[PDB]
Amino acid sequence: GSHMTQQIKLLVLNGPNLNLLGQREPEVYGSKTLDDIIKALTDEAALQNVALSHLQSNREYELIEKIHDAFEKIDFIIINPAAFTHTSVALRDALLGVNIPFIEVHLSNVHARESFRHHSYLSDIAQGVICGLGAKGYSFALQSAIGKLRNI
Amino acid sequence: SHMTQQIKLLVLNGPNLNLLGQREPEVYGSKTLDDIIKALTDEAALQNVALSHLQSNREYELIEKIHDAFEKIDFIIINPAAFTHTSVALRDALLGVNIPFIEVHLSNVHARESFRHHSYLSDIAQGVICGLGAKGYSFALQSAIGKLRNI
Amino acid sequence: MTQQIKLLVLNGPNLNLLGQREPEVYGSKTLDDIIKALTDEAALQNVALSHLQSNREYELIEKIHDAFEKIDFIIINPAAFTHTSVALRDALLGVNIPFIEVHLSNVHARESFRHHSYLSDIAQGVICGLGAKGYSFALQSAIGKLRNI
Amino acid sequence: TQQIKLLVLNGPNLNLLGQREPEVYGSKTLDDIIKALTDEAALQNVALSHLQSNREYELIEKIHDAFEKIDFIIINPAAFTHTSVALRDALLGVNIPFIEVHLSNVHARESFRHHSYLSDIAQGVICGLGAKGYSFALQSAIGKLRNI
């Protein structure tokens, strides 16, 4: 209604092995890169007055240090921790320590894979979780974050 | 679109979701399952998606609706609510008719009691959305369109 | 003229069989005899008791939905649905009417799957193994909570 | 011999047999099975009745209605094997002997399917022999009731 939203500052964090997307047998498994996904997500965010920053890393410390740098500069996090979902208590405690709401995203439906993959050190503290929807899960998390911060 | 083929989508809601918006609206929120399915119907009709909906406290009525969907429906969105944790019969219904589905939960089950972590559906769903509220239905609808139209 | 308590008694599956197989071997008492006796005891205390027994999970859930802002208290013997119905747990949490859980038999003396309840942890309390007087104890207990004696 | 009264109960999803990819998974319906089983029973002075249902309550209430009408039950509870304590308590409460049948080998599928709320109180269990499991259960019931 008759009022203007301030700019959301949103940080997207991607865990290990997601830099491989689009590279192995592109003709067999798909040609789309993490870069094509972040670029399309950045454009979708900027239409809605969301300023999107992104880090992908194989290095657990680079995600943790980015979350610590987020304190008082970021309103929301979207994170696909990939394999760190199952193993990083450090990341859990980084997100609890800076107290920024987040949504957890997985490309694949982890509930269909090995049974170790069913357990997350993040899901219980996340505002919510999206699994198995491919790249569009990032766009759903973005739509969800805007809704919760603008109460719309 | 007098562009695309009509998708036939079935939305199924499990027990107790009929209570949404009823108790202490001023404390827990005002929105009804009706309001959610009306808004989702409007979103689907703009994309040439024909939405039909059943909520029920009766296990049997969800299973028989899944049976009746065979060769009529392209995709299912289901919030089974408590039946996620208990209904092998709903799992066997979805496997027997072999229509792809997405499982939706309004609340974040991973933050509630630990029995709620277990689903007889998650492992066979094309994917799962938890904790995003009513918009989880609209994400599942956008996902189904994406998969069926390759877009 | 304390206020009239509106109390709902819910019985789960198979309790309709009470008293009916080898009555002279296992006891004579029907669910009917129990609910009649309980209704009379309630009416002496200005408690309006209504009752549904069912083998249909949906009928217990729908009755709990319909109880919202009509009922002060529930006494429930869910029988076998104690062990399996998350949906009934979510119905009682969703309408937020206090209840007590009753079992005629001592479940802790029977097969070990019977030890787990999807209700015991949200009940105001639990009575097991005292037979039909368990309903009468739940009734006395509900009057106590509601009349703050 | 005395006419045996036999009740066959079939649980959820079994109405789907024959219907999806008939050319790939079999063309045979629950109907074809129960017709053949009724004929086999009538040759042995066994009066067979049947109920299939997706509704737990219809199976429970049929077991209640069976008390002092039925000598034996054959039941394929399908998914309810794994979840319905209420059916277990219905069969215990009416105290009719029964046999449990499954068309598929459940031990070869997901490991939740290994647990039954019925197997321990059944006279017997037949898994994985397809529709002939029903006919085995019928021959077994006749044998126990006619001591043969």
Place this chain on the structure above:
Amino acid sequence: TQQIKLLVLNGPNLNLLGQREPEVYGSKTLDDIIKALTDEAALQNVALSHLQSNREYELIEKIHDAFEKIDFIIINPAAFTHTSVALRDALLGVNIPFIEVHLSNVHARESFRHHSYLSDIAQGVICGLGAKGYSFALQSAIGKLRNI
């Protein structure tokens, strides 16, 4: 009717009732409860005796002393429910029927509290109904002993 001899046993920490933040948690003592229960018993020709103790041995030796003096036991073993096999073996050894009572709903507290070394051999169990649980157990004992 014959005079019933009833023994009430209360386990550790129950002497604390009424004492900490009386205005916040209730002002009612174990004393108030046992006085009221003795009066209720005497109206029904039930001779009630009581022992509360923080000492496991005093409860065990009281159960031994009960043999051929007592018709029924009501016991709130408090924390000993979860830990005392010795009390289980004392009640089995004297073979007096008993009912187990807890003031609070143990199923709503930490999950170690869900296990009892007594629940399976008790005639019955009452949890979470506060002090009236004692009076229910008394009415139940009278009913079984006087067949009413």
Place this chain on the structure above:
Amino acid sequence: MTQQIKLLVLNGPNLNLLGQREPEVYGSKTLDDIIKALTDEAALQNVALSHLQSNREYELIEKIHDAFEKIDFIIINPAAFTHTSVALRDALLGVNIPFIEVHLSNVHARESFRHHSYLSDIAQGVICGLGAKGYSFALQSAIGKLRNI
């Protein structure tokens, strides 16, 4: 003149004791009576049945090895080796002859270690608790699979 089926029946330990302890208390029937009856029923269907019972794990394994390209189907009551012999599981997987598993008693009603089988998951199916007719049902079932009726 359907083709002659070559069927091997294998019995595990302790089944040699059948009918022998308190015959007038537990039943009269020996393993011998069962195998004779089964052989006759097989011969009516142009099924050539051969049988080995043994308390020796090795003799069951070596008989399954020797069955390779001589036998169309196995009926096996492994008795106590159901719970403990991985080696028999690997023998039936190694020769890749289909089998059905039979138990005279309902194992699911007995001690809870008896619920687990190193065979049930690779069997074409399983029969429990119907006594000696279980062998005759397995035979009828094998003819059905092999003659595609």
Place this chain on the structure above:
Amino acid sequence: MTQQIKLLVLNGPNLNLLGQREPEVYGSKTLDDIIKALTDEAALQNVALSHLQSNREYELIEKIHDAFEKIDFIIINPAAFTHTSVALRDALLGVNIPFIEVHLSNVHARESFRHHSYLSDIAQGVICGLGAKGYSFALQSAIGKLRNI
């Protein structure tokens, strides 16, 4: 004139009840009869036997403390404290006197919580299910270890 062995026999809770409920139904024998018999058998072997039975956990612990450098060997039937007393385990480890654990009944045939002992793993050994002769076997065994025959 081998050396005099000082042997302490410790009995746990509820063993005072032996022989006393339905003596003509369950057996006549008291703990007293057992300890008298055992004392006589010990005195024939120049074994000085002392005995404490108790329902008090503390009295068994304090007796084990007092045994330090007075006692060569302990025979203990901890009865129900086998399953629950870490403190008794730590008392026997703290004084480092060898013991044997005795149970009259076969605990492995009873409820499955009775299978676990906080003592069996540090005992020199364990006797179950042979009734009162188990004490006499423990005594013969302790003489054997101490007299190296």
Place this chain on the structure above:
Amino acid sequence: TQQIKLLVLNGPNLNLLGQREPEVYGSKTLDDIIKALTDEAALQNVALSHLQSNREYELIEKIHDAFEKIDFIIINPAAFTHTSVALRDALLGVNIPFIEVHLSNVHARESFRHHSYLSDIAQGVICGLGAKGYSFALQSAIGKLRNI
């Protein structure tokens, strides 16, 4: 008194006793033990026979051959305690009472060794008392059979 017929069965690896580092672990053989036990039995009009074997089948078939020849069995099944359901079913099937003996304290070794397929159906179990465990089991069998 009547002559008792007693069978002693010893499981795998027990033929090794006395043989490796005799000066370090003991010089005593299974032979020395069974000779001493035969002498002790003959003084009490107990006719003792023995079989030790590394072969599961020889123990099972000896238990079958014992039916209506033997009053009592003493068995040290050694490793077969933990693995042979077949031996459990052989002793149940012939219904001869037995006692289980182990030379070592199994509760002090690896935790798989805590489980037995025999302990629950044995008359009794003796662990960790070395060769005298055999002589205790013999005295126990005589006591039960001669009511003494």
Place this chain on the structure above:
Amino acid sequence: SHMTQQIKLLVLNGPNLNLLGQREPEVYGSKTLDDIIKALTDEAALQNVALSHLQSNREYELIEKIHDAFEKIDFIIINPAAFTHTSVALRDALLGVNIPFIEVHLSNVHARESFRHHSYLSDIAQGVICGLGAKGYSFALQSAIGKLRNI
């Protein structure tokens, strides 16, 4: 201090700690529980902390001492020894009187048998010290002073 308020501190020791220093002093050490409580009393008296102590092999004597501490004691230091693993009644005593405590163990329980990893007290203690020997009591005392004097 004719500076600070006196803290009233209760030190409770569980079963078998009376044996300290008794068996093979030349092998396992010479120090008695007496020597430890004397040194800890001297340390507390310099800080205007009144220390009272009970060791016992009797469960009941620890529980009744906790009861008697209500409205007399500001803090408890407790080495429950074996009763850590077994006494729900001691847990319910400390929760009923609601005096803050610190749990101390002389040995490192995490390096002994695995049953010793489990405590009916650790989750309610203000904190836990294991494996530091007798000085663990003096650390618990320094911690209690820190918490109660805000220093």
Place this chain on the structure above:
Amino acid sequence: GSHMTQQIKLLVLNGPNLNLLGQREPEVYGSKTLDDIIKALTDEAALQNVALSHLQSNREYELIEKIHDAFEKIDFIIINPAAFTHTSVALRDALLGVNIPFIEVHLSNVHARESFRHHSYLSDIAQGVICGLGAKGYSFALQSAIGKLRNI
């Protein structure tokens, strides 16, 4: 008694997220930084002829490499591994490999938090463990190390 102690070389290692101390709602949760704690610990150590070195890190490799560099240069370690307690077998094997005694310290009482936090890949090999005492747990570990190395 009538003899002088050599200088102890003591290394304090702090794991992930402990750099956040003092930063979030200081007015609500406390204003004290890891730096104020290490500074006060350094002063307390230097009074007793203990030379204290310190590394805090979000990066698992920096703790491991510091433990390897400690070999033959450090007499004792005090470590608060924070979330790495629950997940780093690498750190366990670094401390076993250099064979320097250590004490494990947690600020919070982990036994009161989620149940995953009850399990440590370190506690069983530690000389001892201190949980829930706040910053003073470091000073207790230091007093304990001096006692064990000087047999006082």
Place this chain on the structure above:
Amino acid sequence: SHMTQQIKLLVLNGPNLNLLGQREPEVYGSKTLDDIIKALTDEAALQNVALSHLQSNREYELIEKIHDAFEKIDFIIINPAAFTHTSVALRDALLGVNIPFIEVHLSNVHARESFRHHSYLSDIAQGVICGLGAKGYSFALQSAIGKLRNI
């Protein structure tokens, strides 16, 4: 070598390995246990290793061969096949004669069913090789020579 001392090595193979190369050679491979032991004998004889071999479906024949190895054999290579998961008696045979061994499996058990992850032998073996095929025997032989000749 008229250089080194002869090593006496016993190779033991468990049940069902006699089937190697028999069923669908054109699908699953042509190699027999015979071919493997002949090639391994040739490899051992070039290194002054005397190889003797027993395969058996009989548990007892492996145990009695281990008994007979005492003071005759320097090392054992054993592929127990299914008996890895079930034979406490084979474990107790190897511990009683106290000859060092290496456990070999042709297939990668960690990739098959989860009961196959558990061994009553692995924890006492000097080491374990899985999943490398027939060459696993030749690696175990090279390892035994390395350990016994310090090379």
Place this chain on the structure above:
Amino acid sequence: GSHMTQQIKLLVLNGPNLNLLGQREPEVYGSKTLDDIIKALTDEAALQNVALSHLQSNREYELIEKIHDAFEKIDFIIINPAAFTHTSVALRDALLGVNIPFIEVHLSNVHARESFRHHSYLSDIAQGVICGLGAKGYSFALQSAIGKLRNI
């Protein structure tokens, strides 16, 4: 037979703490370094027309990034993940993502140590596993890789 093998490109990866080999009480536990082992393995490989590259690291990201760089440049991996066997799902998913066959090697017999060490996030996907054979396990993995790639 009458035909020439192309050059195998083989990558050896060593996890944390393996740089410590040969350094602690060499007189008690052995004097051999990871370097002496890689040097002898390189020589054995080069005799058989195998070009061997090696990275050892305490840093999980350096192993992951090396596996990603291996894609389309390496035919086979030999990896001793050391303690990362028990904890790194990231490494599992790096090896699945580049789809290069590997063999897992441990110096020690992990089945004889603590029971946590019995579980690997790698063993199930490995072509095979070698434990407890010391340094020669690397040479066995190398002989095994040549055999599988040359069908010899």
